[PDB]
Amino acid sequence: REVKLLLLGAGESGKSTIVKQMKIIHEAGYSEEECKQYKAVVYSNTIQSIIAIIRAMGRLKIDFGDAARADDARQLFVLAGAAEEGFMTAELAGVIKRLWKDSGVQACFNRSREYQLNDSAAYYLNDLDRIAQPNYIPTQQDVLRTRVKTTGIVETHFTFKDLHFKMFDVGGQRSERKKWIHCFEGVTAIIFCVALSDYDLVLAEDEEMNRMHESMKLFDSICNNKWFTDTSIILFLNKKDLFEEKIKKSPLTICYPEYAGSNTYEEAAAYIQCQFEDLNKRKDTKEIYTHFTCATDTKNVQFVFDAVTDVIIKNN
Ligand SMILES: Nc1nc2c(ncn2[C@@H]2O[C@H](COP(=O)(O)OP(=O)(O)NP(=O)(O)O)[C@@H](O)[C@H]2O)c(=O)[nH]1
Numbered sequence: 169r170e171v172k173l174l175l176l177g178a179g180e181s182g183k184s185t186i187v188k189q190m191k192i193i194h195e196a197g198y199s200e201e202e203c204k205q206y207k208a209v210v211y212s213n214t215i216q217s218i219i220a221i222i223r224a225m226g227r228l229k230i231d232f233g234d235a236a237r238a239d240d241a242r243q244l245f246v247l248a249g250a251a252e253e254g255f256m257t258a259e260l261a262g263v264i265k266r267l268w269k270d271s272g273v274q275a276c277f278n279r280s281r282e283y284q285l286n287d288s289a290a291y292y293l294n295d296l297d298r299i300a301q302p303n304y305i306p307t308q309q310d311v312l313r314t315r316v317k318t319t320g321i322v323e324t325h326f327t328f329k330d331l332h333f334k335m336f337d338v339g340g341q342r343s344e345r346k347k348w349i350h351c352f353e354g355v356t357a358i359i360f361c362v363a364l365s366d367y368d369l370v371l372a373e374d375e376e377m378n379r380m381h382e383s384m385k386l387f388d389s390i391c392n393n394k395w396f397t398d399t400s401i402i403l404f405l406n407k408k409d410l411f412e413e414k415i416k417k418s419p420l421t422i423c424y425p426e427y428a429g430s431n432t433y434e435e436a437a438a439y440i441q442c443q444f445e446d447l448n449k450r451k452d453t454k455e456i457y458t459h460f461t462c463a464t465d466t467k468n469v470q471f472v473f474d475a476v477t478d479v480i481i482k483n484n
Pocket residue numbers: 177178179180181182183184185186286287288312313314315316317318319338339340341406407408409410461462463464
């Protein structure tokens with residue numbers, strides 16, 4: 169009846185978002201009090217995103233589309249402190265809206281692989297009127313879209329198909345990887361997450377290292393670890409939604425110079441799957457259970473998790 173699941177993968181791969189989904193799917197979702205706890209995270213993420221774009225404009229030498237935005241940028245810093253405390257005035261919202269709508273700001277936003285920016289920047293910025301309303305309470309999707317890097321070990325429990333799951337989540341940033349070993353005992357299954365959309369990005373800790381290459385190294389280490397011979401290895405090729413949009417405009421050759429396929433979702437997605445699955449040194453004795461996911465999409469995760477659960481019931 170007992171099942172231990174361990175979520176692994178590089179930073180920003182979506183591990184913690186999968187954990188949040190278990191609450192929505194298996195429990196009754198986030199309560200009003202719990203949602204309110206995320207209000208300051210949504211506001212902080214929103215302000216940090218617009219600030220990151222404005223910072224990049226200086227570094228890349230991009231001017232504002234309309235000159236009047238310079239004073240809005242000044243007012244952004246004067247007012248930014250409140251959001252961080254869970255407050256969002258109409259004045260601050262207006263400043264952020266005008267900045268977000270500016271052509272120069274948009275030009276910089278569209279060059280985000282050149283700096284570090286939250287995947288949920290557009291999600292919150294495009295929905296400013298809603299999140300800025302007085303008495304705003306985060307929705308389940310707003311909670312799922314929040315971003316806070318994991319430190320330490322998060323343990324979550326839930327019952328599904330008469331099984332009591334004990335799910336462990338850890339940080340994927342370089343500084344937190346030394347902690348993965350504390351979770352290595354009695355693992356029924358490992359869910360290794362990979363952000364498909366990372367193929368053209370670089371690590372925050374190092375701008376010379378391709379994020380997908382880093383992910384591959386980690387997977388090769390985990391999948392081939394003799395300690396995990398009897399542990400089910402589940403591979404979540406995550407952020408499939410972002411990958412579908414990006415493949416249309418950013419060459420996969422940035423990551424795999426030898427890629428000869430077209431810039432289409434199906435071909436490119438299958439190529440990446442093969443690149444990771446080929447790292448398995450024991451293809452005849454060890455199976456990898458791969459699924460393409462969008463961690464923020466509850467219905468997608470529900471069906472994928474139901475499928476993963478059967479594999480676990482049947483094998484472990
Ligand atoms: N659009 C989209 N965003 C996603 C998806 N999966 C996760 N995110 C977003 O990506 C950000 C990072 O996700 P998170 O779960 O925190 O990543 P992590 O692997 O736990 N990072 P760490 O290792 O640092 O704890 C969050 O803002 C989350 O909402 C996805 O499939 N699509």
